[PDB]
Design a protein around this ligand. Structure first.
Ligand SMILES: CN1CCCc2ccc(S(N)(=O)=O)cc21
Ligand SMILES: CN1CCCc2ccc(S(N)(=O)=O)cc21
Length: 185
């Protein structure tokens, strides 16, 4: 892919974070803490899952960013509507306003309804996310494997401003404590 030149500087929005997340001072890294992180509750915070949004909102144009997932066992990445549900249980699907992929139990899947099996020969350590608002496209790229395509959602019906979306995953196993990191341009 030659999408690198639409690169955007993403930062995480603390106010949207699940109360157990720890976001770095530069707002470029997030990990699961071992307890509640001593913040007040608010209507923006994802309550049920270790999720957080980017601060940036996109309503036009082409955008690209990269995320480091080194040595994680579980995570979700992509974009979502600004108005997605924050409280209670929900599925990651385009019907619910999410365009995402994930790693879970040693397999990669795209968040369609129902979910789609991905075919990745080289487990990624960094993921590239490309959004073309006008075209209705969200694409994912394997930066570890020379930028190879992972998945494209096309005919997307965004129906609102988009925000970068992150889930660091639970750490029931003790093997998923590592952070998500936004990679430099
Ligand atoms: C997002 N994520 C993480 C890994 C396991 C899993 C299983 C089902 C679903 S779903 N299709 O119900 O949203 C989502 C999901
Ligand atoms: C979002 N969702 C819905 C239910 C299935 C499932 C499983 C694992 C995770 S995760 N990535 O937070 O560990 C999330 C999730």
């Amino acid at each position: 892919h030659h999408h690198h030149h639409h690169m955007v500087h993403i930062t995480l929005d603390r106010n949207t974070a699940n109360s157990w997340l720890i976001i770095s001072k530069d707002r470029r890294q997030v990990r699961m803490g071992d307890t509640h992180q001593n913040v007040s509750d608010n209507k923006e915070r994802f309550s049920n899952y270790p999720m957080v949004l980017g601060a940036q909102r996109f309503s036009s144009g082409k955008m690209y960013w990269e995320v480091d997932v080194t040595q994680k066992e579980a995570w979700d990445l992509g974009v979502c509507r600004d108005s997605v549900q924050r409280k209670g249980q929900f599925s990651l699907s385009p019907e619910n306003g999410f365009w995402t992929i994930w790693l879970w139990q040693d397999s990669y899947e795209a968040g369609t309804s129902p979910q789609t099996t991905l075919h990745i020969q080289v487990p990624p350590c960094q993921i590239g996310i490309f959004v073309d608002y006008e075209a209705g496209v969200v694409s994912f790229y394997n930066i570890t494997d020379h930028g190879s395509l992972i998945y494209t959602f096309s005919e997307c019906v965004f129906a609102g401003p988009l925000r970068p979306f992150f889930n660091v995953g639970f750490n029931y196993s003790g093997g998923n404590a590592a952070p998500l990191k936004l990679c430099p341009l």
